[PDB]
Paper text:
Given backbones from this diffusion process, the Chroma design network then generates sequence and side-chain conformations that are conditioned on the sampled backbone to yield a joint generative model for the sequences and structure of a protein complex. We sought to characterize the space of possible proteins parameterized by Chroma by generating a large number of unconditional samples of proteins and protein complexes (100,000 single-chain proteins and 20,000 complexes across two versions of the models, v.0 and v.1).
Moreover, the two designs with experimentally determined crystal structures demonstrate that a non-trivial fraction of this distribution should be expected to be atomistically accurate.
Author numbering: 3 to 138
Write the structure that this text describes.
Amino acid sequence: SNDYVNQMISQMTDLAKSLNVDVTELITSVTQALEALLEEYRREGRLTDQVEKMASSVALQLAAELLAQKALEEGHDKKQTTAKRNQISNSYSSEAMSHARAWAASRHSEEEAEKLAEELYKDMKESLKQRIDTEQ
């Protein structure tokens, strides 16, 4: 929705401020990559509300890791930049996995749900990262 995209962009701008780097160039690449991933998941019948929320969390994790690299390239302090990156990335990967586990718990047996949630995160992050890099 409009609110889903705007919420993601708001959070991306927050993490950009934290890392002291301009969010501008990544907004286009991340929004386009996220849109394309969601359309693929929808077409294939893989999308649910928790999966959509998870995808925003993963996009934000990747934005933080990419923006932190640009902060290092711009000369920002390495210890502070990487500490902030790691805190932000940890927060978003934790959020993403919490959505993944909620998706899996109502749909799969207790035995396989953990592995499928882990696999969903891995596959989703790999796909988004490839899509973001293609746009960039």
